[PDB]
Design an enzyme around this catalytic site. Structure first.
Site, mmCIF file in Angstrom:
data_model
loop_
_atom_site.group_PDB
_atom_site.id
_atom_site.type_symbol
_atom_site.label_atom_id
_atom_site.label_comp_id
_atom_site.label_asym_id
_atom_site.label_seq_id
_atom_site.Cartn_x
_atom_site.Cartn_y
_atom_site.Cartn_z
ATOM 1 N N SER A 125 -30.185 -22.404 -1.910
ATOM 2 C CA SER A 125 -29.813 -21.233 -2.718
ATOM 3 C C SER A 125 -28.317 -21.325 -3.023
ATOM 4 O O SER A 125 -27.859 -22.390 -3.466
ATOM 5 C CB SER A 125 -30.265 -19.966 -2.003
ATOM 6 O OG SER A 125 -30.338 -18.873 -2.903
ATOM 7 N N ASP A 132 -40.764 -18.185 -6.498
ATOM 8 C CA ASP A 132 -39.479 -17.688 -6.023
ATOM 9 C C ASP A 132 -39.088 -16.418 -6.768
ATOM 10 O O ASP A 132 -38.834 -16.456 -7.978
ATOM 11 C CB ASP A 132 -38.400 -18.760 -6.198
ATOM 12 C CG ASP A 132 -37.135 -18.458 -5.415
ATOM 13 O OD1 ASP A 132 -36.773 -17.272 -5.279
ATOM 14 O OD2 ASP A 132 -36.489 -19.417 -4.940
ATOM 15 N N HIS A 177 -38.943 -18.029 -2.092
ATOM 16 C CA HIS A 177 -37.550 -18.360 -1.785
ATOM 17 C C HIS A 177 -37.424 -18.743 -0.310
ATOM 18 O O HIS A 177 -36.820 -18.046 0.505
ATOM 19 C CB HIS A 177 -36.623 -17.205 -2.139
ATOM 20 C CG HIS A 177 -35.176 -17.586 -2.150
ATOM 21 N ND1 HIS A 177 -34.665 -18.537 -3.009
ATOM 22 C CD2 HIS A 177 -34.133 -17.159 -1.399
ATOM 23 C CE1 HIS A 177 -33.369 -18.671 -2.793
ATOM 24 N NE2 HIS A 177 -33.021 -17.847 -1.822
#
Length: 225
Positions: free
Chosen positions: A115, A170, A204
């Site tokens: 991320s 995600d 995610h």
């Protein structure tokens, strides 16, 4: 305010001839990814996972939490923390330099992250002049993409290998932001060394298949001896 804690380490069994530097995501520390990378470790590789400082995050009403830089929005059109990304990029550069004086040249170092951790990896790799071995960019994006000229970047890191991974469910960093990123990456560095992998059903987070692909990528680029 608080000091910089020492990075979480997965030490090498044999003499460390290569190193992986992995940057965690929002709100996290290095400890979780340290135990993840230990699960796919190789004898000659040292795995470093530095910790991000706790700082207020504009996206969530300046509530303080571990963050490599400020997050203002979750969209490709959102404002970015240009000052903070550049400043954090120098810290990562300084961390790569602390391992080259441990006897590990930069060209035997993979810089990765998850991320916003992955986003910092991509920006640092594509701007530093230390030649690196590769980038593992997980569920991330390319920050400040508008600041890159339209041709190849050229310099020490022109043909770096990049493995970008992303899940198609995600909800925080959507797949589209990863696809926009890898398409811009293909015009900055030699696209033959850029691999994009999509994980169906993943959100995610990370999957077991992804770690397997990250391991195959690190093994290929940092072989023994």
């Amino acid at each position: 305010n608080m000091s910089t804690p020492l990075p979480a380490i997965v030490p090498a069994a044999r003499k460390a001839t290569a190193a992986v530097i992995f940057l965690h995501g929002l709100g996290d520390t290095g400890h979780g990814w340290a135990e993840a990378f230990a699960g796919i470790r190789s004898s000659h590789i040292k795995y470093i996972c530095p910790h991000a400082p706790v700082r207020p995050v504009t996206l969530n009403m300046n509530v303080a939490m571990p963050s490599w830089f400020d997050i203002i929005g979750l969209s490709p059109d959102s404002q970015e923390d240009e000052s903070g990304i550049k400043q954090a990029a120098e810290n990562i550069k300084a961390l790569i330099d602390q391992e080259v004086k441990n006897g590990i040249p930069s060209n035997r170092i993979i810089l990765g992250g998850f991320s916003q951790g992955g986003a910092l990896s991509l920006y640092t790799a594509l701007t530093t002049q230390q030649k690196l071995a590769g980038v593992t960019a997980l569920s991330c994006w390319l920050p400040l993409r508008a600041s890159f000229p339209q041709g190849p970047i050229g310099g020490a890191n022109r043909d770096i290998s990049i493995l970008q991974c992303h899940g198609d469910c995600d909800p925080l960093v959507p797949l589209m932001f990863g696809s926009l990123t890898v398409e811009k990456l293909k015009t900055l560095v030699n696209p033959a060394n850029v691999t994009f992998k999509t994980y169906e059903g993943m959100m995610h987070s990370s999957c077991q298949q992804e770690m397997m692909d990250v391991k195959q990528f690190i093994d290929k680029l940092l072989p023994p001896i």
